[PDB]
Amino acid sequence: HKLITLLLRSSKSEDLRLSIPVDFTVKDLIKRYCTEVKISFHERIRLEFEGEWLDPNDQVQSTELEDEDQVSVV
Amino acid sequence: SLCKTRLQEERKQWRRDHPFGFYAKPCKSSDGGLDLMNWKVGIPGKPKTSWEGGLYKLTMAFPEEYPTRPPKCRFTPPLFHPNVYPSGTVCLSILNEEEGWKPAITIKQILLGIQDLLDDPNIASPAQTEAYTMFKKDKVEYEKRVRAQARENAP
C-alpha cells in the first residue's frame, strides 16, 4: 500500500485531507498542500505534529505519522 | 482498566482532530511505550491578545482514579497570570473535583478552557499575588509583562 491519509489543518485555510504516498518527503507534502489549496509554496512553511516541527527532508514513512493524523500547517 | 482505556480513546481522538496550534501527547514510559498518565501539552495564545505568539507548555498528570478525579495541570515553567499558582498549577473550575470536574470533561475541553482563561482571568480567585494586583491596579504594566512572556515562549 502506497498511501497514507492526513488531515492538514491551518489557521487561515479550510481543512484539507490528502492521501499522499508515504515515500513523499515532508517538503513534497507541503508542496502538494500548496497546489491543493492554491497558495504559493515557500521554504519557511512548516508542519507541526505533537509539538515538533517535521523535517522537510524526512520521508513521510520515516515519521511517527499514522493514518488520519492531523498535521498543523504553519 | 477504565483509566487507561479512557486515556487511550482521548489520545486516539485528539491526534485525529484538535484545535490548530495546540499539541498534546503522553510521555514515553520507562520501557518505553506510552505513559498515558503523564502528558506534555502546548496551548497557543489567542490572536489579537497580548498572549499571541506564545506557545505555553503544560504537563497534565492523571491520577489512578481518573476520570472520576481530574488531572493536575501545571505550566512549565510557571506562568505569570492571576490564576496560576507559583508552582505553575492552574486554578480552574472544571479542574476542581468539588466544583466543575465531571468524568465527561475531555482533554480538549480542558485545554480550550485554560486557553480561554489566559486573556480572561477570574478576578474572584487569585492564585498568584503579583499578577493579580498588577492586573487589577496596573493594567498597562500587566499587559506589558504578558507580551514579553509571549516572546519568551515563541514556538
From Swiss-Prot, chain A:
Consult the record and explain the modifications the protein receives after translation.
Answer: Phosphorylated by cds1.
Q: Can you say where in the cell this protein is located?
A: Nucleus
Q: Which domain of life is it from?
A: Eukaryota
> Quaternary state and partners of this protein?
Interacts with rfp1 and smc5.
According to its UniProt entry, the function of this protein is described as: Required for repair of DNA double strand breaks which occur during replication, or induced by UV or gamma radiation, via recombination between sister chromatids. This has a subsequent role in the maintenance of chromosome structure. May work in conjunction with the Smc5-Smc6 complex.
Q: What is this protein called?
A: DNA repair protein rad60
Q: Which organism is it from?
A: Schizosaccharomyces pombe (strain 972 / ATCC 24843)
Curated annotation (Swiss-Prot), chain B:
Q: Which UniProt keywords apply?
A: ATP-binding, DNA damage, Nucleotide-binding, Nucleus, Transferase, Ubl conjugation pathway
Every copy of the UBC core domain together lies at 2-155
Return the Pfam families for the record: UQ_con
Q: Which GO terms describe its biological process?
A: DNA repair; protein sumoylation
UniProt keyword Nucleotide-binding, yes or no: yes
Q: Which pathway does the UniProt entry assign to this protein?
A: Protein modification; protein sumoylation
Q: Where is the active site?
A: C91
For this UniProt entry, the molecular function terms from Gene Ontology, in alphabetical order, are: ATP binding; ATP hydrolysis activity; SUMO activating enzyme activity; SUMO conjugating enzyme activity
Please state where this protein is localized. Answer: Nucleus
Superkingdom of origin = Eukaryota
Q: What is its main location?
A: nucleus
Q: Cite the PROSITE patterns for this sequence.
A: UBC_1, UBC_2
**Mind naming one GO cellular-component term on file for this protein?**
heterochromatin
- Which Gene3D superfamilies does the record associate with it? Ubiquitin Conjugating Enzyme
Q: CDD domains, alphabetically? A: UBCc_UBE2I (cd23798)
Q: What is its EC number?
A: 2.3.2.-
The family note in this entry says: Belongs to the ubiquitin-conjugating enzyme family.
Cited function:
Catalyzes the covalent attachment of ubiquitin-like protein SUMO/Smt3 to other proteins. Required for efficient recovery from DNA damage or S-phase arrest and normal mitosis. This may be as part of a checkpoint independent recovery process.
The protein's name? SUMO-conjugating enzyme ubc9
Species in which this protein is naturally found: Schizosaccharomyces pombe (strain 972 / ATCC 24843)
Give the gene that encodes this protein. Answer: hus5
